[PDB]
Amino acid sequence: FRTFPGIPKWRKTHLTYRIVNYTPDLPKDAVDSAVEKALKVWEEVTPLTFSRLYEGEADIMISFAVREHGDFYPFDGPGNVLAHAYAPGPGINGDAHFDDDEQWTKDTTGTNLFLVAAHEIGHSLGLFHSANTEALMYPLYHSLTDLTRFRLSQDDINGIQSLYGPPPDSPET
Numbered sequence: 001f002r003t004f005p006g007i008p009k010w011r012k013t014h015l016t017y018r019i020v021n022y023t024p025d026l027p028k029d030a031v032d033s034a035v036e037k038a039l040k041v042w043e044e045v046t047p048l049t050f051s052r053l054y055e056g057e058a059d060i061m062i063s064f065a066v067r068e069h070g071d072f073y074p075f076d077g078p079g080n081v082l083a084h085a086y087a088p089g090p091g092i093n094g095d096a097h098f099d100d101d102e103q104w105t106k107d108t109t110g111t112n113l114f115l116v117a118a119h120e121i122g123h124s125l126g127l128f129h130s131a132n133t134e135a136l137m138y139p140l141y142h143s144l145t146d147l148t149r150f151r152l153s154q155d156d157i158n159g160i161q162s163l164y165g166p167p168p169d170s171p172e173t
């Protein structure tokens with residue numbers, strides 16, 4: 001995890017997101033699921049909340065692109081960069097791009113989209129590669145016998161929480 005020159009942090013908890021386009025491999029709902037999942041993954045370790053917008057300009061407008069797609073980060077075929085994302089902010093910032101020139105799956109068999117989505121989103125949220133191998137923010141793909149149990153490492157939470165931090169358990173004191 002990391003911050004930025006100005007400290008990454010949205011001024012609102014009620015965030016919005018949107019998938020501009022999908023990949024010629026997965027179904028729509030399936031793709032959106034990856035985000036829906038990535039979001040929840042962080043929702044578990046932040047007070048933040050999310051909402052989808054059938055139309056309009058959402059805060060996190062997730063949009064895929066192959067090869068060149070603006071800026072200076074030209075995709076190229078399958079493999080390599082699976083998905084990249086920038087710190088939070090207007091314009092290029094907040095957004096997240098995947099590789100449309102790559103296969104995708106909804107579980108541990110292909111390049112688990114959600115698994116990748118929870119990484120890119122991390123950049124969007126305001127944290128970068130962490131110092132743990134079990135972490136999904138690590139600069140290397142990481143799977144599990146059962147992703148249905150997957151979780152972010154303390155390394156990841158460290159930042160996501162340090163920048164925010166959800167409330168304690170209700171049934172307490």
Ligand SMILES: C[C@@H](N[C@@H](CCc1ccccc1)C(=O)N[C@@H](CCCNC(N)=[NH2+])C(=O)Nc1ccccc1)C(=O)O
Binds near residue numbers: 119135138140141
């Ligand atoms: C590209 C961006 N996103 C990562 C996701 C890594 C990840 C880890 C754990 C769970 C999900 C996702 C990514 O796609 N990394 C690439 C490496 C990009 C190197 N770029 C460069 N040198 N300019 C990656 O891991 N590719 C890859 C694909 C298949 C197998 C192994 C690695 C990043 O590197 O920060």
Ligand SMILES: [Zn+2]
Binds near residue numbers: 069071084
């Ligand atoms: Zn990009």
Ligand SMILES: [Zn+2]
Binds near residue numbers: 119123128139
């Ligand atoms: Zn990364």
